[model samples]
Target: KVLKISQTKYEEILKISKKYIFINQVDKSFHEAVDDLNQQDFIAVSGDGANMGRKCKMPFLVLSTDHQIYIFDIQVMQYHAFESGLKKILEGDSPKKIAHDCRKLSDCLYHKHNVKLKSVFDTQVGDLIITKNKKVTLPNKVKSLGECLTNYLGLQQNTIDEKLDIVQSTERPLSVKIKDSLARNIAFLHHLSEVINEEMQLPFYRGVECYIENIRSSDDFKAWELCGKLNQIPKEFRNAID
Candidate 1:
């Protein structure tokens, strides 16, 4: 004989919990998100768009400040959002941003919005530094954010729908599938920064920050290529190769 389960208990257990803000226009939510950046010292930013040298025009950006994730529809808001508030934040001054492989993000921001990203700790850069700490010789760059998460954070988020795998950022109305996929990409970037920085200890963390700063300050297309190089290594973590 099988035991009978209570209907009331079963109903409560099946509830879903997922939350993220999709900001498509300049509204109250947009204002709140800008204000929310003040709550955290460092935030996570993830984005996608048409990228190719000066042709890059990224219309989507996701910014997270521990509490909530703000998916900014760059195409929808455009210049208005930047002049008002998005400028200072993305320009890399206050709430330090954390991202993975932000070379494209920087390129597009400069090409599209003329906003230079600063004070960011690219998880891709941080991951390489950590790998080197373990004395593991790796290639200049880490290609996939998912692999970085799995290898370091050990969290493999399988949020992909094979049919919807070919994600088109240009699509409109913003389907649930795309939002989920975008959220998955940045969910751990902030956490990844904390882990890598901790693993690298205090000194190397500073070194890493200096490297990212130099990358952002260089000439547009020229700097994008350095995403793979391991230059400017501090004495503590220096390989010192010519």
Candidate 2:
């Protein structure tokens, strides 16, 4: 098993890393992040700025491999991130992309970028499986990624949704606070995934990998959010303007 980082200390350091790479464009920094992405097949990813309620449709893609966190200026990079190889790697089936609630992420990736995510381990999906979709138990009640962290790691992980709700994700110089929150979430996910895998101690977790690929690759982006009825997404929660 890989050495696990102490949740407290790890997050503290994650809050402060000189290794932060901003993939502003296809430059040396972008290649460095890509290089790490190749080796860290078991990486965690998260994003903001999709059509969910923001001006930017592409997003600020946050990726973390081990201790390093990379932020792709997708809002700025746009097709460059895709044309410059980010799309191919994400669309590749070999590496395992760990994410939480990737529906929206995949949603925009397809509808906006024409990119389909492949070979993913959705942590939220796994939680659903572990909880048996039952609302009676603690483990079964884990709904959000924040909940997962609190339940499994006993960490009071912070969230930026409040701040995120106010700003345009495409806005340049993504606030330092937002950057910290995003990086923490990404790091929290990888560590959480590792913890869950240990808890599961089974083969089928990975076996069910393709299950998410199917939905995310399809047009079910609004399936979960919309449920089965005509419920509108709260404008406050939306990352874009309606």
Candidate 3:
């Protein structure tokens, strides 16, 4: 699997954002501080990747049942450290209840640390379910995080263009790119769950399994891959590819 930022850096972000965001850094100390509580509530997770040459930097944002945000660096945190920390924290809980945006995140955690997350909410899939009733159809276009927020919550996003500008610019610092992108992504999921639960009158634990079934049948992945491929094709065959 792909590696992410270190637990150290993940803790740093939490410490920095804790005042405003209620984020807590989950280290060995946290596990040692608290014993098992027999809690089985569903937690939401969202992740974003930054392109760093051949590797993508991954930051996973996990929101607990109480709405406290925790950040984890999948690549930088050692496999044992992540596995042990998660295992210790969620001792009584089952892996089938975690909510996340994609299977890739769960797959990586399971493959690297044997922390299996069999079920997930997958917001991209949720967007499809919520928007299926709309008259306007988007056949091949998959909603991005920003788009998903706008579509579901009736909120507008202004950062999409600025993010694209930074992605294409070589002069900007990589740290800034990753930090800015990751922060917003984490925030998006935090609020997304809140809005969905409130609007639909459903608890965090319900409907995710049903949503996962619809997610499995989605063609969004193929659409996303084609969109990415079209962007990278050389000018010579750009028309042919299109």
Q: Best-fitting candidate, measured by lDDT?
A: 1
TM-score of 1: 0.69
Query: Each prediction's TM-score against the native?
Result: 0.69, 0.70, 0.49
lDDT of 3 by residue, 4-90 (tens): 334564455445334223223455544532322114345545534322312333333333433344444444444544555564443
**Residue-level lDDT for 95 in candidate 3:** 30
RMSD for each of the candidates: 15.1, 16.0, 17.2
- CA shift at 87, candidate 2, in angstroms? 0.5
For model 2, give the 10-residue run with minimal summed lDDT: 233-242
Local accuracy of candidate 1 as per-residue lDDT tens digits, 1-242: 12222455323322211367889888998989998986679988874452443475666777887657778887778888887688888785778888877887788788778888888888788877766765568667664676665665555445212233334567777777777766656665666577667766845566666666766777977577666565644333343221
* Candidate closer to the true structure by TM-score (higher is better), 1 or 3: 1
Candidate 2 lDDT over 42-132, as tens digits, reads 8777855553722237658887787788888877788888887788778888568898878888877877787898889888887776555
Stretches > 4 Å off in candidate 3: 1-29, 32-40, 49-66, 87-100, 110-114, 133-139, 158-181, 197-242
Task: State how far residue 100 of model 1 sits from its true place (Å).
Answer: 0.6
1 or 2, which is superior by TM-score? 2
